Design a protein around this ligand. Structure first.
Ligand SMILES: Nc1ncnc2c1ncn2[C@@H]1O[C@H](COP(=O)(O)O)[C@@H](O)[C@H]1O
Ligand SMILES: Nc1ncnc2c1ncn2[C@@H]1O[C@H](COP(=O)(O)O)[C@@H](O)[C@H]1O
Lengths: 111, 111
C-alpha cells in the first residue's frame, strides 16, 4: 500500500491530530508554512481523477475536517487547501488527500 | 452580491463550460497555467471557514465536477485543485469556489 495506507494501519509513524470513522489528519513531514497538515480518508482512492460520483460526500468531508482542524490550530487569518493530482499536480502519494496551509501569507500563483 | 453571485445571475460575463442543478464552471480571468478554471456552487457560502457540515456533498461535488471538466479539457497529465480561504489564503471573492490548474508542471510550495 502507500505511505498513507501504512499510517492508517499504524505501520508508519504520525502524530494524529483528528480522527473519526472516515478520515484522520496529521502534520506534513516537510511543512511549507508554519501550519501545514494533511487530511486523508480511510478509504483508498489512488487519485482524485479516479474518484467516483459516490465519493463526493467523503471528499467534502475532508474539507469540513480541514476547516475544523484549521480552527483548532488557530488559523483565524485564513489558509489554503490543496489537492495534488498526477505528475503535473505534483502528486507523490497515490492515496487521495487534502493539504491545508496557513500561518503566513500564501502567494500567487499557487505553484 | 459578489462577482460570482453576478455571474450566476447572468449579470457579469463568463463563458460557461459546465453547469448542472448545483454548480457551474468558467475560466479564470487571470489564468496562472495554460488551463485554469473555477468551479462555483450556485448556493452562496461566503468562505469555507463558515461552511456547514451539511454542505459536505456540495463541496465534494465541486471536486468531482472539477475532475470531469479537467478530463474534458485534456488534462491527462494531472492538475492541482485549490481553495483560497481568508486573507492568508489569498481569498478575493467571498463566494466559495474551487480552482483547477493544469497544462504545465505545478511547483512546490503551492504559494
Ligand atoms: N511519512 C510522512 N508523514 C507525513 N507527511 C508525509 C510523509 N511522507 C510524505 N508526506 C507528505 O505528503 C505529501 C505527498 O505529496 P502529495 O501527494 O503531492 O501531497 C508531501 O507534502 C510530503 O511531505
Ligand atoms: N469576472 C471574472 N471572471 C473570471 N474569473 C474572475 C473574475 N473576477 C475574478 N476572477 C478570478 O477569481 C479569483 C478570485 O480570487 P480567489 O478568491 O483567491 O480565488 C482570481 O483567481 C481572479 O482571477
Amino acid at each position: 500500500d502507500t505511505i498513507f495506507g501504512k499510517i492508517i494501519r499504524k505501520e508508519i509513524p504520525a502524530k494524529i491530530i483528528f480522527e473519526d470513522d472516515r478520515c484522520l489528519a496529521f502534520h506534513d513531514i516537510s511543512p511549507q508554512a508554519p501550519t501545514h497538515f494533511l487530511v486523508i480518508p480511510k478509504k483508498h482512492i489512488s487519485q482524485i481523477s479516479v474518484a467516483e460520483d459516490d465519493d463526493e460526500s467523503l471528499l467534502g468531508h475532508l474539507m469540513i475536517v480541514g476547516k475544523k482542524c484549521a480552527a483548532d490550530l488557530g488559523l483565524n487569518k485564513g489558509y489554503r487547501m490543496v489537492v495534488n493530482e498526477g505528475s503535473d499536480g505534483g502528486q507523490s502519494v497515490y492515496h487521495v488527500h487534502l493539504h491545508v496551509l496557513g500561518g503566513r501569507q500564501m502567494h500567487w500563483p499557487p505553484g
